[PDB]
Amino acid sequence: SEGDLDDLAQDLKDLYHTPSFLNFYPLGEDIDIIFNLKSTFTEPVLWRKDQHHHRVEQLTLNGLLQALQSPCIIEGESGKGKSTLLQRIAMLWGSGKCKALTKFKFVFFLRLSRAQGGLFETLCDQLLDIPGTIRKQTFMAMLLKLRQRVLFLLDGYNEFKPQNCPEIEALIKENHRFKNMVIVTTTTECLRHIRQFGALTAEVGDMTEDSAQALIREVLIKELAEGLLLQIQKSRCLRNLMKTPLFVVITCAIQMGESEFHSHTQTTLFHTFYDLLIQKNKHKHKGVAASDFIRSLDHCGDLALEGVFSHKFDFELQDVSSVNEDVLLTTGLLCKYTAQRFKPKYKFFHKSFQEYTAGRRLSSLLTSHEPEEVTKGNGYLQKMVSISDITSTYSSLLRYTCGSSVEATRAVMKHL
Amino acid sequence: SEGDLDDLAQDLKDLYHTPSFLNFYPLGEDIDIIFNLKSTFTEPVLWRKDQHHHRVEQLTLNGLLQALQSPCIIEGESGKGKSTLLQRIAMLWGSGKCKALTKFKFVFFLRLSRAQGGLFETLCDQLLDIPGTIRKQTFMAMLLKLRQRVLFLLDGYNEFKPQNCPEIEALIKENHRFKNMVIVTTTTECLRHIRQFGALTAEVGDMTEDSAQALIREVLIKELAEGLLLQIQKSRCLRNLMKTPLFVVITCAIQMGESEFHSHTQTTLFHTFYDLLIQKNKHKHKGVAASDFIRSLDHCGDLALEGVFSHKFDFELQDVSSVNEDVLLTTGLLCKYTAQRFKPKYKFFHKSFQEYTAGRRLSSLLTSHEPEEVTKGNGYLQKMVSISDITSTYSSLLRYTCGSSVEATRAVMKHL
């Protein structure tokens, strides 16, 4: 019973070249845009983390793969786009081009969030239907005897509920009972459930200038691609924003379908980003009252606005003081960091995002029909009385506030 | 056993030459008109789609068949007449004339909308009754061992309810298990349920001048055929409309049964088409109240009319703002497009159809017994006060309005 093992290895190699594996939805299934893994994010950068949990050594794919350890934990950037890294590893093995992966007899790419019933059942139904020849639980014996010649690539750990498949939870933590190699991807918020068991950790970095331009050029009609690439080259700000995958994909998604180039000022870009963030997690916000959800978002809004005036970007628990923040963290407006820290820290996705949020909130206050809200809005606007702050500290805030409406602009321009 | 496989191949070849397969109803079974696949639409053209969902490289049948990939998705133009393409493939194989198809041992033409109970059961009852000599589920083992020497042609995907036959849904999406070739035909509206899994995609194009004339000549008594061909040659408008199959077959259907040639002004042609759309799908409009169906049609009518005045043919969701629009999408008045775009768009079947729709609505308003509706009708008519618009922009609108009613004509002519 050896011939069928070679067949399994070959079928997996061919499986990882199929469109059903290579095609994915970068903004989620709700938006029907499909990228082909083959010509998209093909040049990732990974930072290694040391005992102090900071970044050391810039590593790249096909570099890290030459120095894999017992279970490796790769942390998503901050919960940005899809961590299309494990898929790239499986693809390279299937192509047989990366020397580092030639030692592996099998590579099993699994979506852990859908695992249930046991490891063998997960493999049988989720990947390749295993021939009855050896479908007698002797497969597991083969893997144990085989040792570290197989990779289990487990995506979506943060979405995994271990009660559904204790066998895999054991594989991730109790690796000494399997004697094989595992790579798991997670998010910052759920890192605490693991990490302890990692032999090597890595963080996904941002995009390079060449990667971002290549992604735009190859996934957008030439005329719009040239328009966008030119605008990025002209702007001294976009080139710094176009490092974050989501802000590279969104700027294309909003242009596809058009027959002409549109500038799409960053204010609209941040607005689009915001709506995607608020709505994509809406499917999990059914657990709270709609009024509680809005109150939480408004609270976050005021937090950002006060933060801008106080030059504060790093928040502690007592600065939020809301048990209902769980929906806010689910939403993803704030990221909760719990590394080598006595007290948890809360941060906004990006400093420019915090400024946007503050702007949106101020704009809303200044246009409210309720005089109490308008007064509060004016209370903040009335601080814009010094040129050294107007053209500096609050430059972003004023731009985002004005770009969010018409009436808000009147209020701001009259003051200025 | 090998002799039984040969008998099946031969029986299928002969099956596809049988009138029960070749004869079809181009306007649906409700209208008792039968076309013979052998002499009708014999020269289709297909457009290959690129990664941007744009049309490139016009292909022909017996061309595309030389470059087939794992499961191929062919999209109907917009939901027109029967997509008699897969049947042509079955014939070409059965006749043994197309070299590209000579490699196939079996070709299975299935009407997916009528599948249930499993793939083997569907094949046994829908096509050729498989002899009891090999009807032991060993047929599937044969197909798996045989590999890509068979074609599954699955028509009517948009009408398929996968819960009835998970085996075929698997065949369409999970083809890594089957290792055979599948061609699926679908519609724009249901494309989003697939595509990701497609290796190659194509769009069905329009008719050539020679094809349309051949279709008229061979399916209409000589005297009427000559009359129609001459009228098309004289006019400067029909020749552009006679590219859409629906407007080639309808113009014949309304003449067959007559003993003389009638001009049948294109206003009546568009009327006939409109009436068919709201009736052929009537069988699926039983899920709404009668008053809601009419309100949706009136809403669509006003949408078209405003669009004519605003030069707007491309609508978004917020321009309709009605959850009940599903009945219009079911009807086929509006087509929903979900390509590589951030937001969905809605379009009318054809710009000339939108103009007709607007005309029909304006005509109705101008003849209503309710003075409020008449006022609205006049509100639009009162804009026809500039010669540069009267003989241009609104030329079609005025013609369709007048040709829809005598009373509407009086209102229009008095104004002009």
Numbering used by the authors:
A (entry chain A), B (entry chain B): 94 to 509
What does the paper say about this structure?
The NLR family caspase activation and recruitment domain-containing 4 (NLRC4) inflammasome is a critical cytosolic innate immune machine formed upon the direct sensing of bacterial infection and in response to cell stress during sterile chronic inflammation. After sensing cellular cues, NLRs (including the NLR family caspase activation and recruitment domain (CARD) domain-containing 4, NLRC4) assemble into a molecular scaffold that recruits and processes inflammatory caspases (including caspase-1) by a close-proximity mechanism, forming the so-called inflammasome cßomplexes. Here we identify Bacillus thailandensis type III secretion system needle protein (Needle) as a potent trigger of the human NLR family apoptosis inhibitory protein (NAIP)/NLRC4 inflammasome complex formation and determine its structural features by cryogenic electron microscopy. We also provide a detailed understanding of how type III secretion system pathogen components are sensed by human NAIP to form a cascade of NLRC4 protomer through a critical lasso-like motif, a ‘lock–key’ activation model and large structural rearrangement, ultimately forming the full human NLRC4 inflammasome.
With a total of 108,418 cryo-EM images, two stable classes of disk-like particles were isolated and further refined by imposing C11, or C12 symmetry, respectively. With the 11-mer particles, the CARD domain density was slightly improved from the refinement without imposing symmetry. The C11 and C12 particles were subjected to symmetry expansion and followed by local refinements focusing on three successive protomers (tri-protomer). Both tri-protomers were modeled as only containing huNLRC4. The huNLRC4/huNLRC4 interfaces contain several conserved residues and intermolecular salt bridge pairs. Compared to mNLRC4, huNLRC4 has two additional salt bridge pairs (Asp104–Lys272 and Asp222–Arg270), while both the Asp at positions 104 and 222 are Asn residues in mNLRC4. Noteworthily, the Phe435 from the activated protomer is positioned in a well-defined hydrophobic pocket in the receptor protomer. This pocket contains several conserved residues (Ile124, Ile126, Ala346, Met349, Thr365 and Leu369) from both the NBD and WHD subdomains undergoing large conformational changes during activation. Interestingly, this pocket exists only in the activated open huNLRC4 and is partially formed in the closed model.
